[PDB]
């Protein structure tokens, strides 16, 4: 019993964190096999960030200009290349702690853990979600760039995010491990506004199922709804439209609790229309959307 | 920018998790140097838990009855002893992954990270607090016993909690690493009620300072209060009394923000009396109390 915002155990990712320095800029890198991945803005000064031409800036850099340190020992850089917004620094030594891994590009609404790092050293781990506007709501200070987001399936780490920037609104943007930004963001010190941060409806429903499994049941009502009726309400409250694909993904939770997905939609419809009336669900006074249906099943079953 | 419920990187603790089996019961153990620490109720059957005489049950167990497995390899048990509610299983091999460590008994209101484990394998990491009633609000299923709570200072892991039980109300109780339960709880399958779960006032104030640092400032008002006036309000709302010791601990946050501790107390007094009026602070619709002043400083400065 109990339900917490849980992150994946970070050990396999901690063993990959290194410090990358180029000139006067230091950030984090991810060392997998004989390659170190890091944000390409490591080659920029604060002045360069205003309007950088990364291809031109890179011409002035050689392998010996990228200082890579794993703990207290120096890695020898034998090659460098730019792939989209990430630099790939080939080193002469394979990381002995390289876990089984994959690079995945996640979709909005999916969750992952972040190992926040500074100077190649891990500071903490937290769980977050790729928002529908392609930003993440993290906790990152200057020096955290190159910190990564990931999911774990048994012994395989799927890296999905690398931190690159903070928007002027305090929200965060980054890339997948191929260097492609999520959303329309660019690695430039220019104000870039984020779109509507809508609520991840399928995740709220998954979290309501988690609440019922854990005994918080006050919000269950005598009503049902349809996908089209529910979606009129979701539109009004800046919630993502629920589809039959989302209903299908909620199937195991509906089966375990015996609460039909459309009945849980009607409970959510009432919570949106009436509010919580000073009450809480799983220790929260708002509707939580950073648990996927898979996260709920995993936590509720104890998958290791 | 941004402020998250962050757990310590769990790698150093993952390297200590092992599986302990005695008879038909399996739970987690903590392997440090040549000792494996685990809850003494590993020697009980479900029937024994009703009224166990641990000293008598232990007489029927020998070193070879405690099966300890670290990953896929078996540890040889060369001694066993009971210290309060924990068993200490001496093994013939020192854990090569033993980090620098200490055993600490924490006070109510202090936070720590939990590495939830099943069958010796880590499932996830989350942050929580020792409540004023000596329970923790965790996420633990059957098989999670022996999972530990800890804090990290640079390279030293301070273990403070070992999970032993779930109360009939869905809250959790456990011991320090000396086997002494926090609070009045016992390792018996008897209903034991928890006391008033009061709010950790110093932690709420610390979190309001974190909110101001991150730009959420709507709750700042034109008022001040006194410790005695604030405490009358804290009493009414089941908040812990604020002392001059708590004010002193909030000093660095008061210094950084320029907001006097008693002025922040007056903001909190108004939030208690008026509610949030449908607004949020750091993504929360309630007053968060599971960040200590030390946690706020650490996260706001990027300590690794
Ligand atoms: C300051 C800071 C704080 C937290 N997270 C990231 C950054 N860093 C940036 O925004 C970098 C400078 O720009 C990126 F787009 F290239
Ligand atoms: C069931 C369960 C689920 C989650 N956490 C712990 C337990 N386990 C217990 O309560 C054990 C049986 O009693 C302890 F007091 F000795």
Neighbours of B19 (CB within 10 A): 23
Q: Which two tokens stand for residue A107?
A: 């979709």
Q: Give B5: exposed, middle or buried? Use CB within 10 Å, 0-12, 13-18, 19+.
A: buried
Which residues between 122 and 151 in chain A have a beta carbon less than 8 angstroms from any beta carbon of chain B? 122-126, 128, 137-141, 143-144
276-295 in chain A: CB under 8 A from chain B: 276, 278, 280, 283-286
CATH of the domain at B285: 1.10.1840.10
Distance of CA A44 to the CA centre of its chain: 25
Q: B141 C-alpha to center of ligand 2: Å?
A: 8
A82 and A104 within one domain: no
- Considering the domain architecture, whether residues B181 and B244 belong to the same structural domain is answered as no
Q: Are residue B108 and residue B10 in the same domain, yes or no?
A: yes
Bridge partners, A17 (sequence order): A30
Residue A45: give the domain boundaries: 15-99
A243 to A152, A226, B25: CA distances (angstroms): 27, 11, 44
B117 lines ligand 2 (CB under 6 A): no
| Residue B145 burial (C-beta neighbours within 10 Å; 0-12, 13-18, 19+) | buried
- The 10 Å Cβ neighbour count of residue B34 is 16
Closest CA to B40 of B64, B74, B66, B71: B66
CATH number assigned to the domain comprising residue A58:
2.40.10.10
Do B238 and B177 reside in the same domain of the chain? Answer: no
The verdict on A45 touching B (C-beta cutoff 8 Å) is: no
Give dist(CA A202, CA B220) in Å, integer: 35
- Find out whether A144 and B304 touch, Cβ atoms under 8 Å: no
Task: Give B268-304 as a DSSP string.
Answer: HHHHHHH--TT--BTTBSS------HHHHHHHHHT--
**A125:B9 CB<8 A:** yes
Which of A134, A135, A129 lies closest to A207, judged by CA? A129
Domain end position, chosen among B197, B229, B256: B197
Regarding whether B114 and B167 lie in a shared domain, the answer is yes
Q: Are residues B24 and B72 in the same domain?
A: yes
Residues 6+ apart with CB under 8 A from B136: B114, B128, B129, B130, B149, B161, B171, B172, B173, B174
Taking CB atoms and an 8 Å cutoff, what residues of chain A touch B119?
A: 304
| Inter-chain touch B4–A138, beta carbons under 8 Å | yes
Q: Using a 6 Å cutoff on CB, does residue B225 contact ligand 2?
A: no
Tell which residue, A148, A149, A124, A17, has the closest CA to residue B8. Answer: A124
Token reading at A254: 């509906």
Kindly give the number of the ligand 2 atom that is closest to the alpha carbon of B140.
4
Is A111 found in the same domain as A2?
A: yes
Q: State the total domains in chain B.
A: 3
- Cα A167 to Cα A163: distance, rounded to the nearest angstrom: 12
Phi-psi region of B197 (alpha: psi -120 to 50; beta: other; left: phi over 0): beta
Contact A213, A300 (CB under 8 A): yes
Q: Which of B168, B197, B226 is the last residue before a domain boundary?
A: B197
Same domain, A8 and A120: yes
Tokens of A141: 């200070």
Test the A interface: residue of B3, B8, B11, B19 with most A CBs within 10 Å: B11
Method: X-ray
* Residue A251 burial by Cβ neighbours in a 10 Å radius (0-12, 13-18, 19+): exposed
Does ligand 1 have an atom closer than 6 angstroms to the CB of A191?
no
* Residue nearest ligand 2's atom 13 by CA: B165
Same domain, B8 and B121: yes
Do A3 and A115 share a domain, yes or no? yes
Give the chain B residue whose CA is nearest to the CA of A112. B124
Q: Are A139 and B215 in contact (CB < 8 Å)?
A: no
| Separation between Cα atoms, residue B224 and residue B232, nearest integer Å | 14
Q: Tell whether ligand 1 has an atom less than 6 A from the beta carbon of residue A141.
A: yes
Q: Are residues A8 and A145 in the same domain?
A: yes
- Contact between B267 and B179 under an 8 Å Cβ cutoff? The reply is no
Pull the structure tokens for residue B207.
Answer: 């979190």
Do residues A20 and A105 share a domain?
Answer: no
* A239: DSSP letter: B
Mind giving me the DSSP string for B153-182? Answer: ETTEEEEEEEEEEE-TTS-EEEE-TTSPBS
Last residue of a domain, which of A40, A68, A99?
Answer: A99
Count of residues for chain B? 304
Resolution of the structure, angstroms:
1.6
With vertex at residue A240, the alpha carbon angle to CA A236 and CA A243, rounded to the nearest 5 degrees, is 115
Q: CA A23, A24, A27 angle in degrees (round to 5)?
A: 95
Establish whether B145 is a catalytic residue: yes
Residue carrying the six token digits 């809850």: B39
């Amino acid at each position: 019993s109990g339900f917490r915002k849980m992150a994946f155990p970070s050990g396999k990712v901690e063993g990959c964190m290194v410090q990358v320095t180029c000139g006067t800029t230091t950030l984090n890198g991810l060392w997998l096999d004989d390659v170190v991945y890091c944000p390409r803005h490591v080659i920029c000064t604060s002045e360069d960030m205003l309007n950088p031409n990364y291809e031109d800036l890179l011409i002035r850099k050689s392998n010996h200009n990228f200082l890579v340190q794993a703990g207290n020992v120096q890695l020898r850089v034998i090659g460098h290349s730019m792939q989209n917004c990430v630099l790939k620094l080939k080193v002469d030594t394979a990381n002995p702690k390289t876990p089984k891994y994959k690079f995945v590009r996640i979709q909005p609404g999916q969750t992952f853990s972040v190992l926040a790092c500074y100077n190649g050293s891990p500071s903490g781990v937290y769980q977050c979600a790729m928002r529908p506007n392609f930003t993440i709501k993290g906790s990152f200070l200057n020096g955290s760039c190159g910190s990564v987001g990931f999911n774990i399936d048994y012994d395989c780490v799927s890296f999905c995010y690398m931190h690159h920037m903070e928007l002027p609104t305090g929200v965060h943007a980054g890339t997948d491990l191929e260097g492609n930004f999520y959303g329309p963001f660019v690695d430039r010190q220019t104000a870039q506004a984020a779109g509507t941060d809508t609520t991840i409806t399928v995740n709220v429903l998954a979290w309501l199922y988690a609440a019922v499994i854990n005994g918080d049941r006050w919000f269950l009502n005598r009503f049902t709804t349809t996908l089209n009726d529910f979606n009129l309400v979701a539109m009004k409250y800046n919630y993502e439209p629920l589809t039959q694909d989302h209903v299908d993904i909620l199937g195991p939770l509906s089966a375990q609790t015996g609460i039909a997905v459309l009945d849980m939609c009607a409970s959510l419809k009432e919570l949106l229309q009436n509010g919580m009336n000073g009450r809480t669900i799983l220790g929260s006074a708002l509707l939580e959307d950073e648990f996927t249906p898979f996260d709920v099943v995993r936590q509720c079953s104890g998958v290791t």
